[PDB]
Design a protein around this ligand. Structure first.
Ligand SMILES: Nc1ncnc2c1ncn2[C@@H]1O[C@H](COP(=O)(O)OP(=O)(O)NP(=O)(O)O)[C@@H](O)[C@H]1O
Ligand SMILES: Nc1ncnc2c1ncn2[C@@H]1O[C@H](COP(=O)(O)OP(=O)(O)NP(=O)(O)O)[C@@H](O)[C@H]1O
Ligand SMILES: Nc1ncnc2c1ncn2[C@@H]1O[C@H](COP(=O)(O)OP(=O)(O)NP(=O)(O)O)[C@@H](O)[C@H]1O
Ligand SMILES: [Mg+2]
Ligand SMILES: [Mg+2]
Ligand SMILES: [Mg+2]
Lengths: 527, 88, 527, 527
């Protein structure tokens, strides 16, 4: 059984659902915004300042008010997926557009023309935002962006700025929970995986349980090695060379393992054996990428080369390798330089191909393995409850800092949307209803700065008027510093947000709110 | 008391159809920019000198109102028991 | 347990059910119609302007009112299945016929004779519609039809007009969700399938991961190739030929794959191997269609030819082939021209045979593979909520544009039904009750234009009277432009809709409404 | 469906939940604190004075009050995990910080700045606590710490002091339930495991069912021994040696067992056979550690040495071994001294590595086996109800005594927090709200001493004022002895707490309470 409501009754239910969801989220906006504790069924509750986290948990008893809440939830979800930051701003913008659109529709305006006017206004706003953008120059902007996104935490900003400096432009930063109360940064460089240490006798540094080989050869092979006769010829050539040898295979099993460790123990050779990384199809994907930067050959099953047929020529050359219980890493290799950027390019074009089938971030992980280093930021706190909140802030700053590198930075504190809305006064359309949609966006663009001031204990409209007049008296970048409560140059003060975050938030908010405004009837099941 | 003293001006602004806190902030700013007598007119929505405009009140009315209101509120804050007959 | 209601009580329940379903659907009619949000149990709600989508979700608690709603739901469902457009118009027509029929029956008319009179009137209306039809001349009518069906979206109309131009008359247009916010058109030509790239070493263009073969042979074979001795004779011949060779087989396994890649790596030959498309019976269906246009032989199991017995003569010839991870395509072939025309005639004659057993659109896909190209329109939007609405509009315009090619165009905005109803004045019958049925259709035919004007903020009867008099003063094609609110020539203004959509809508509406009018009793279970 | 509450209503629910949980726990604080009986679904109820045990069972019907209770439960849980003592003090501190923080927020202070001020104050308090710490000198401090942690039980303190003296610094103390009413201390030294006594005939002391071997050889081997021909050579050369031989193998099966016992019965050789300890991967972990301190070789599978190829040189030497139904222990061996230092050194570094994968305390067990001895304190009582309470007190004192060895001791009775809070008067910050957070910690730090006095029948504020003035008149270590009710030097009187317990309790309490103070909204499911 279904019930259908029309007209003002339908919009009243939608507005109530949107408002209730937005009210809970909007309390976390700004530097002086407060946190929301979310009930978890099993275990301790979750305390979070993250906008999309709060929105994902919101559901209502009324079916029609729930429909409004679910639609606006997609604003925060899409913003989080694309930008990773600005979810609270997007939710605030979505509520402002919907509320103003309802007022315009209540005056008799055509909902379709209002949506068309909204679309035109956003295109102008996005173009104005891009013109106001500033490229990231160096560590100063990186640290400033990270500090602001981490809720004005200088400690987090310094760590992330160091992390980006170490891993370079092509690096990948990962955030994990630390086992202690301290927060540490771990950076590794080279092609490293999660195997190694087949036997305890493969030890060269007894003080650290680490096996380090100086100028070692590597053996890339895709199947198990268990026959002694096929295993012998490679070391027969290797012992002639005299350099250490490292085994990367499916498994070194029984007799083949036995002869390798015993021969190593006698001291005639220096060798180690590790498992090859991956499972299923990851075997071909990983070993090929391991072989490309080592200067050797993968010796795959397709090449049709037996173990006895191998020689020193196709064995790759490495400088140093370190093997422990879990981690095996290589410092460098003999692989040609032009090959790695070809693989780097091949992955980047494959991103569009992989996006249709991927479910893991291994697409980016492979890129950073042969192009730089991967940093792991271990967030630590005295108690898990504080750890969850701190880890969320670090992840928010990491995502925001990455976006700043891509599309530059913009003045923070909502000033960028205020400046962009100033260009909407010159935009004119032939349709009166489409003009109303433009006015809706202009009012909505100035909403976030008012909400930030309201959360800080200041009147939103008083701040907005001063910021508007400061654009002409002082400059575009001048705004309101809600942290301490005065007006200053936001860019010089370090209060900046990525251009991507601002652009994504306004585009997502208008897309959902504009679609919602064209509704006339709601169909839902009778409880 | 400081919050209470600033309540009647907000109520007057709210009744006339304006935002009370916005009016209160403007009046506070005008105290330093223009003078103490500057305030908000409710008959017409503009700020002007109340003494010059003739919108004035006896100082006895203001003095008695705040004293009487604080007196009754103080007694009710420390009231510990209410005795009344059971109806019917 | 059952309860039976009779007479006026039975018709009252049916009318309430029909009206409630029609009221929800009719709000989406016209260029200024508004959308309906439909609750979904899991996930975000669906916002749609599509008439049949809204009608499919409607259900009522009252068993007798539900029977009325379910019967009218078949009007929109059948119209969508046959024409793909005009579902809202069909629902509006069905309500008008049922409401007018109830009034005539309440006066004492025979329901059976009313149904007979309705059937006669529709035959006259359909004949008048065909007389008013105009054949599609070129891209101008195609773009105009697509724009109108897409709710006056010029961007969608331009893309679909380009898509039809590229794929020709025999092409197939597919609509898919884009991974980005932009909407793009992708067109491929030739026989292509979803296999390829057996081994990574089959690369001729490292800059695009594409294996392109210049003037290659193809090997059509239906089983696994694993034996070494049987594989060698075909390469012993083509290495004499020297041109590239491509393998289409169930699988190239182990040793057979090993010798192929190693031989290719050595540079003596250039070759690649792909899987045969389809599953189960689809291998036989597809390989024969692959072999027919390449000028070779399928070398099927029935032919009883071993791998060693093959030669160059039965191997087909192709100009270019491109192989990647998923897509393998052929540009041309040596197949005889008269053979494919037989195949397309066979498939078209098999359409009636396939319609009794098919469950996939592969019947048309095979048609376009060897007779033209297939276009994929990737609809993109900032948010999935807007994406679903945009994709629905594109699909509606694609179906409408195809129908316009088949049976021509006719003036839009409900003018065609108004002009057709004018011919019902000259139709006379000997039975008074059958005459009432004719009058029912005449009133119903003029309902959609009134509803469109009502949705646009204009009085329906005032518009209808002006449109009726404009038929004599100006011409048949003159109507009311509800988009801007004036009267103009609909055909010249580009406000046109397919003749098939109009013909199907009136026929389906009268078939169900006429059947319902003959009811006297309703039997339903007691809740 | 969810409901969201804001502002004062949200904090009121949180305060009620925190207070109700804290009130139940706080009745157990101090030497004169009382116990809490906890209902168990099956079996007798549990009577406990342990703070974290009481807190773990607390749950409330109101969803929002439950959120407050669950958050504070993490204070006691984390304190118990890290320190093992002071859970009641941590819960008392957490309630004091939250209650004072609510009052400050109700005055209009910024919650974020209050949290920042709290963090700064705790850093000063922890630094002051470390300055006030005193290292443990010997048995006197060890006995005093154990006595206080065991609720002023001199019998428990004497036993634990003896246990630490026997096992040394690297030893491990285990607490188990005794089968009788008496409490006994059992200490074993050497590498001992839970196998032995394969056959009843391996007896050298018929008065105890103990097989004692004088200067025996041990055979370390990882698989079953069942073939007679491979089994003979190991006795063929040890019978030449003439010393007793002991077998450690996966199993001695059938014929190999038969020839071993029969030859032993004849008296020509002295021998015994035991199973090797561990399961799964524990075989390689344990036999290697067994072989390292005996001076022999593990003869593992990787070494590729057959049974017939063994000799006396690779067999280790030991002084004495004792074998019974369950326990097999070795007194000493021929292992080189520096080898076991490296193994001890290898293990402590492996603690950080195995902490991410371990689920058993075998990390410390392996370290204690070759570095000293392990002690088992068997707690006994007349009835199981008293046994559970007594065992909990012993475990509390064992954990507290271990913490005292690590980070030293500090004056007890809450004096240390009072002295540390005195240093907060000199700490100043530029932010007024951050200053309020400092004052919150200062009041909270003096709460536990007031609660202890309240539980003892004294006025908390009267005691606190006297203790504060005694710091200047007499000294830092002077405090209130709640046991008898007078003021004295706590360090000289033996009322001392570990520095680790005090430091952990204040850090955990502030971490949780500060996080909850920043909340503004609560989201929970509607029941
Ligand atoms: N000191 C400051 N003064 C003024 N505005 C600030 C200051 N610090 C940050 N902001 C602005 O406040 C906003 C960031 O607050 P935040 O609560 O992270 O919003 P969000 O990014 O929309 N939400 P989330 O997705 O949870 O990070 C941006 O518009 C910043 O420019
Ligand atoms: N600008 C216009 N002015 C007047 N009539 C118009 C205009 N644009 C479209 N129409 C007419 O409106 C109808 C199309 O509206 P639409 O809402 O698509 O109806 P439908 O096709 O019955 N429903 P659906 O199946 O959802 O597409 C046709 O009769 C068009 O001829
Ligand atoms: N005789 C005493 N006089 C004064 N204070 C004492 C005395 N004995 C112990 N204390 C103090 O009381 C506290 C220990 O009581 P206890 O009930 O164990 O608290 P807790 O350690 O926080 N709880 P739990 O984890 O259950 O042991 C410490 O602060 C001791 O210094
Ligand atoms: Mg943010
Ligand atoms: Mg349509
Ligand atoms: Mg204790």
């Amino acid at each position: 059984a279904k019930k259908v409501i029309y007209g003002e009754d339908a919009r009243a239910r939608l507005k109530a659902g949107v408002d209730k969801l937005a009210n809970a989220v909007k309390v976390t906006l700004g530097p002086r915004g407060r946190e929301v504790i979310i009930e978890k069924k099993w275990g301790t509750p979750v305390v979070t300042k993250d906008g999309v986290t709060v929105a994902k948990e919101i559901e209502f008893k009324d079916p029609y008010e729930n429909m409004g809440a679910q639609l606006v939830k997609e604003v925060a979800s899409k913003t989080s997926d694309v930008a990773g930051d600005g979810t609270t701003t997007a939710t605030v913008l979505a509520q402002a557009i919907f509320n103003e659109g309802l007022r315009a529709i209540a005056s008799g305006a055509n909902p379709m023309d209002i949506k068309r006017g909204i679309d035109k206004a956003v295109e102008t706003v996005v173009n104005e935002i891009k013109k106001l953008s500033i490229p990231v120059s160096g560590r100063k902007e990186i640290e400033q962006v990270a500090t602001i996104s981490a809720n004005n935490d200088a400690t987090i900003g310094k760590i992330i700025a160091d992390a980006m400096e170490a891993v370079g432009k092509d690096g990948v930063i990962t955030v994990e929970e630390s086992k202690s109360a301290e927060t540490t940064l771990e950076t590794v460089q080279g092609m490293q995986f999660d195997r190694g240490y087949l036997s305890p006798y493969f030890v060269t540094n007894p003080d650290k349980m680490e096996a380090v080989l100086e100028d070692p050869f590597i053996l890339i092979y895709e199947k198990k090695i268990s026959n002694v006769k096929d295993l012998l010829p490679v070391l027969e050539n290797v012992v002639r060379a005299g350099k250490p040898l490292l085994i990367i295979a499916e498994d070194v099993e029984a007799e083949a393992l036995a002869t390798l460790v015993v021969n190593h123990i006698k001291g005639v050779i220096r060798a180690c054996a590790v498992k090859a990384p991956g499972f299923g199809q990851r075997r071909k994907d990983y070993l090929q990428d391991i072989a490309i930067l080592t200067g050797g050959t993968a010796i795959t099953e397709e090449l049709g080369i037996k173990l006895e047929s191998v020689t020193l020529d196709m064995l790759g050359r490495a400088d140093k390798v370190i093997v422990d219980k879990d981690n095996t890493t290589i410092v460098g290799g003999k692989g040609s330089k032009e090959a790695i950027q070809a693989r780097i390019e091949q992955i980047k074009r494959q991103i569009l191909e992989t996006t249709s089938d991927y479910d893991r971030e291994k697409l980016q992980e492979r890129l950073a393995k042969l192009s730089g280093g991967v940093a792991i930021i271990r967030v630590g706190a005295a108690t898990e409850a504080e750890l969850k909140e701190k880890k969320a802030r670090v992840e928010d700053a990491v995502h925001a800092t990455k976006a700043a590198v891509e599309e530059g930075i913009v003045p923070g504190g909502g000033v960028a949307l205020v400046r962009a809305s100033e260009a909407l006064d010159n935009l004119k359309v032939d349709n009166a209803d489409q003009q109303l949609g433009i006015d809706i966006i202009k009012k909505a663009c100035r909403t976030p700065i008012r909400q930030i001031a309201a959360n800080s204990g200041f009147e939103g409209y008083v701040v907005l008027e001063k910021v508007l007049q400061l654009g002409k008296e002082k400059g575009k970048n001048w705004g309101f510093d809600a942290g301490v409560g005065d007006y200053k140059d936001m860019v010089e003060a370090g209060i900046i947000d990525p251009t991507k975050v601002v652009r994504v938030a306004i585009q997502n908010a208008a897309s959902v709110a504009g679609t919602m405004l064209t509704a006339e009837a709601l169909v839902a099941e009778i409880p | 008391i400081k919050k209470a003293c600033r309540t009647p001006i907000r109520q007057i602004a709210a009744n006339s159809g304006f935002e009370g806190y916005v009016v209160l902030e403007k009046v506070l700013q005008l105290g330093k920019e223009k003078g103490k007598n500057w305030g908000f007119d409710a008959g017409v929505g503009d700020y002007k000198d109340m003494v010059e405009a003739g919108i004035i009140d006896p100082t006895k009315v203001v003095r008695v109102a705040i004293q009487n209101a604080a007196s009754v509120a103080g007694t009710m804050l420390t009231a510990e028991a209410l005795v009344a007959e059971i109806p019917e």
